[PDB]
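RECORD TYPE: inverse folding
INPUT: structure tokens
STRUCTURE:
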């Protein structure tokens, strides 16, 4: 909702409220 990125730089947010790294988002 809050478009600050998601979590960390390179970290998106999951529907759990936790963070996921977008590294495998670019490779997969």
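DESIGNED SEQUENCE:
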């Amino acid at each position: 909702e809050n478009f600050s990125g998601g979590c960390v730089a390179g970290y998106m947010r999951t529907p759990d409220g936790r963070c996921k790294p977008t590294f495998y988002q670019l490779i997969t």
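NOTES: The two ends are 24 Å apart (CA to CA).
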